DNA sequence: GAAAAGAAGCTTTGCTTAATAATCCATATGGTTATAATGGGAGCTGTCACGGATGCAGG
């Protein structure tokens, strides 16, 4: 969707803004991937699904980071190896909120 | 005889997970300590009845 395009525009705007460099930005399963450079704060990528949900996924994230993203109301799915899903709705205010909580981790 | 409806048969896809890079950490191994530092310790103490093998000795 073009809303996913514009939310990609503000996403790269606020990740490029806040000094969080990217490994690669990928359209994969027709979904966006704002992948972090290193596994910083136990986080892998800042992805966008086309199903109205931008998602933050990681590997062995600390609990207090997860609490900081449930401050802005995000779902989580831990795995058996430390893989953690973080669901939020894809919107510009959620772009600003997720990248401003990620910008203070 | 039409028309909803449900399966056959394709696809994706979010999730998992097994293979593999990375790293770190137990582990071994050896070295190296330059004053001088000179014979242990529990041994049980209240069996016991037989018995055969030493063991010693004088004729």
């Amino acid at each position: 969707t073009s809303d996913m395009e514009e939310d990609k525009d503000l996403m790269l705007k606020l990740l490029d803004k806040n000094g969080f460099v990217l490994k690669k930005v990928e359209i994969y399963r027709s979904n966006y991937l704002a992948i972090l450079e290193k596994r910083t704060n136990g986080i892998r990528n800042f992805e966008i699904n086309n199903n109205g949900n931008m998602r933050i996924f990681g590997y062995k994230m600390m609990e207090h980071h997860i609490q900081k993203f449930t401050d802005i109301g995000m779902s989580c799915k831990i795995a058996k190896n430390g893989n953690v899903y973080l669901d939020i709705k894809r919107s510009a205010e959620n772009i600003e909120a997720v990248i401003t909580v990620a910008s203070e981790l």
Side-chain angles (χ1 to χ4, degrees):
Chain A
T1 63
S2 66
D3 293 332
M4 192 176 182
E5 295 288 329
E6 297 173 354
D7 287 327
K8 186 262 291 179
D9 295 331
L10 188 62
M11 177 179 70
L12 272 70
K13 183 176 180 179
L14 296 181
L15 291 176
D16 184 74
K17 178 182 177 182
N18 287 317
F20 292 95
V21 296
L22 285 301
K23 183 176 180 180
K24 197 263 182 182
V25 176
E26 184 180 0
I27 299 170
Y28 180 69
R29 282 93 163 95
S30 296
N31 304 122
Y32 285 99
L33 293 176
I35 301 168
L36 291 174
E37 180 69 28
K38 303 289 105 177
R39 188 180 60 84
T40 63
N41 291 315
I43 314 170
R44 286 176 176 169
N45 49 0
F46 296 162
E47 69 182 2
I48 295 176
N49 288 319
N50 206 168
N51 302 113
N53 43 358
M54 181 266 285
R55 186 175 292 172
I56 309 302
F57 173 77
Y59 177 74
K60 290 184 180 179
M61 196 188 298
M62 297 178 183
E63 178 66 29
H64 64 88
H65 298 290
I66 300 168
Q67 294 175 356
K68 286 177 71 67
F69 288 103
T70 58
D71 291 333
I72 56 173
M74 297 180 73
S75 177
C76 65
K77 192 262 183 67
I78 61 170
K80 78 279 294 174
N81 54 5
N83 289 321
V84 284
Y85 293 92
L86 292 174
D87 296 330
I88 201 167
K89 185 256 179 64
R90 181 182 61 244
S91 69
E93 294 85 4
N94 292 319
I95 292 167
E96 296 176 353
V98 168
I99 299 172
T100 201
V101 172
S103 297
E104 65 182 0
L105 298 179

